[PDB]
Design a protein around this ligand. Structure first.
Ligand SMILES: CCCCCCCCCCCCO[C@@H]1O[C@H](CO)[C@@H](O[C@H]2O[C@H](CO)[C@@H](O)[C@H](O)[C@H]2O)[C@H](O)[C@H]1O
Ligand SMILES: CC[N+](C)(C)CCCS(=O)(=O)[O-]
Ligand SMILES: CC[N+](C)(C)CCCS(=O)(=O)[O-]
Lengths: 184, 187
């Protein structure tokens, strides 16, 4: 049931933003007793945090498939492109992730989950860049991730300015910049 | 003037509780006016939100246009992009509300239009600066620079204590350095 609720929340949020994800609306979409929800989560914020944790765990599993050695540029691109709205699935994910990032302004649990998530991805990016002798690796890693997050935010609210082919070109350009001075 | 007072109340509510807290009734309550007074100016909550967003983007663009460009592009780019970073309380509030509207833009055509126009305007100015100095891939690097400030602002929302102004300014300086690599400039 809690997994079902997390999927149902993501589904509502992608459709109608997080303002649509009332305890009531999430129940309809999964099955389930409005009490069944209350059984698993004592607060709405608990329910949101669980959904975010689910989305993050799925993202990290995806990074682990695509970021598997060999050419650094291609690995960095495959990983960062998971965060960009390049198809309908990733457009929904980007929408929901951005929504959680704004909701973190008023929710310490969501802010902490995001902080740990960014720390994890950033450390992974840093390890890649250090391994190839990149100048200012850690700072550049932070910048790569921040820039990808910003591109995703910019794109969801203005898709005509950020078609997938443009997003892919912009990510290529950013990666090329980050790798300047690396070997290779 | 009256719609402007309502836009200011909306911003005050949104900076506190997000845009979820910015119902017509909550905005009316914060402004000290009747629901009827609000509905008089705004036919819909959409129109209320769009007007508030326009008010905000006007303020931001006015600040960007006040940047002294002079003869040093790195300095000008830093001064301009610093205005879009949460380096103090006022800009932290602006970041929170602007990010909220960006997210709402995913489902609201009126907000998307205002966001698109804003991004187009800013990218155009940044591209002019970069082309002016022979920056490789100037247009895309302009879009990347703007994305950097947007992404850094987004993260600083949830963890403001961890993104102090000096961290944000350092990150921005490093990105500008990368953006200017291969441009006709003299460091
Ligand atoms: C220093 C180096 C880097 C420099 C970076 C430069 C950034 C450039 C910003 C300055 C330009 C501001 O110019 C401003 O553009 C916006 C469009 O976005 C216009 O605004 C127009 O669209 C908006 C948004 O839909 C409406 O709310 C507004 O009523 C309408 O007039 C303003 O009428 C114009 O005065
Ligand atoms: C005609 C007067 N001006 C200020 C130009 C436009 C009025 C519409 S407004 O206030 O919503 O920009
Ligand atoms: C409501 C408080 N928020 C912004 C969610 C968390 C603060 C995290 S902090 O202290 O590291 O900036």
């Amino acid at each position: 049931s809690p997994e079902r609720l997390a999927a149902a929340l993501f589904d509502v949020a992608a459709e109608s933003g997080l303002e649509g994800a009332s305890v009531r609306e999430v129940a309809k979409r999964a099955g389930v007793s409005i009490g069944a929800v209350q059984h698993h989560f004592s607060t709405k914020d608990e329910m949101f945090a669980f959904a975010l944790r689910t989305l993050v765990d799925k993202l990290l599993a995806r990074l682990s498939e695509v970021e598997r050695g060999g050419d650094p540029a291609r690995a960095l691109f495959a990983a960062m492109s998971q965060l960009l709205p390049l198809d309908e699935a990733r457009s929904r994910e980007a929408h929901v992730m951005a929504a959680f990032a704004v909701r973190a302004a008023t929710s310490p649990s969501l802010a902490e989950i995001r902080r740990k998530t960014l720390f994890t991805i950033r450390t992974g990016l840093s390890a890649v860049l250090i391994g190839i002798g990149t100048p200012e690796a850690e700072t550049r890693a932070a910048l790569l991730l921040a820039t990808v997050d910003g591109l995703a935010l910019d794109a969801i609210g203005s898709p005509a300015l950020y078609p997938p082919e443009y997003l892919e070109h912009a990510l290529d350009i950013q990666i090329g910049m980050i790798l300047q001075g690396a070997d290779v």
